[PDB]
Amino acid sequence: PQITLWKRPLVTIKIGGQLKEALLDTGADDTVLEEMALPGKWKPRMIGGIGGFVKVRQYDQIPIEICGHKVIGTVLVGPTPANIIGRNLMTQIGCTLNF
Amino acid sequence: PQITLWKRPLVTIKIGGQLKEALLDTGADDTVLEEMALPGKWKPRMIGGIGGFVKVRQYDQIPIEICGHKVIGTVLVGPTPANIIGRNLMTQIGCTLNF
Numbered sequence A, B: 001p002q003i004t005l006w007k008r009p010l011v012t013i014k015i016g017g018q019l020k021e022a023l024l025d026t027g028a029d030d031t032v033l034e035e036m037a038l039p040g041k042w043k044p045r046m047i048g049g050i051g052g053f054v055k056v057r058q059y060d061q062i063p064i065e066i067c068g069h070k071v072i073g074t075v076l077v078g079p080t081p082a083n084i085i086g087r088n089l090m091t092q093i094g095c096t097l098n099f
């Protein structure tokens, strides 16, 4: 799809058998999802945003289907106010900015 | 241009006669620039990110040239760690996400 930006570029993702809406976020290096039951091991990590940081759980090699594109990558889980699909996954679905 | 996302989608902007690099940021509603001398009036505003909430100065109807596209819009100025071009301006240059 081509997505204009008059609205937040939200997409429906499937991860860990759960459906979520997430923001395609070109300003996000990484993918950060709200608290969710993911299976498996993790590593503590911190991400920085506007104003603050947040501690997150880093899960490697997690399957995610982003708007019907299955990808597998690192997913951060923590107290983010939005599910964010970062460049780490957007590259895997071949997502470009165009103007 | 078409911009893939293997790197941060940085563009060179011109604003207030100054050249800056800025991130084309689809996860940003608004445009937030680092502290910079802008001429004119402003209103105090707050933006929220990952972790925190920063006070910013809201400037309306500011001319910006983003990668050779002149647009005019609201620019927020404050202690952001990156110049961020948000959807408010990306729409004005016709920027889409595509995959």
Ligand SMILES: CC(C)[C@H](NC(=O)[C@H](C)NC(=O)OCc1ccccc1)C(=O)N[C@@H](Cc1ccccc1)[C@@H](O)[C@H](O)[C@H](Cc1ccccc1)NC(=O)[C@@H](NC(=O)[C@H](C)NC(=O)OCc1ccccc1)C(C)C
Residues within 6 Å of the ligand: A023, A025, A026, A027, A028, A029, A030, A032, A046, A047, A048, A049, A050, A081, A082, A084, B025, B026, B027, B028, B029, B030, B031, B032, B046, B047, B048, B049, B050, B081, B082, B084, B086
């Ligand atoms: C999700 C994060 C991993 C992401 N950060 C990164 O990718 C960073 C660079 N990577 C990173 O952390 O690498 C690890 C690291 C880095 C340095 C040292 C050690 C380790 C991020 O927060 N990035 C943000 C900007 C940024 C850039 C560089 C450095 C730090 C921060 C936006 O690009 C990103 O798009 C977020 C996405 C987002 C959406 C929704 C909620 C939270 C975050 N937007 C924002 O933070 C924007 N805020 C908003 O748009 C909010 C949602 N609206 C808002 O507040 O509107 C006014 C309002 C007022 C009152 C009520 C409601 C709204 C902001 C840039 C304008």
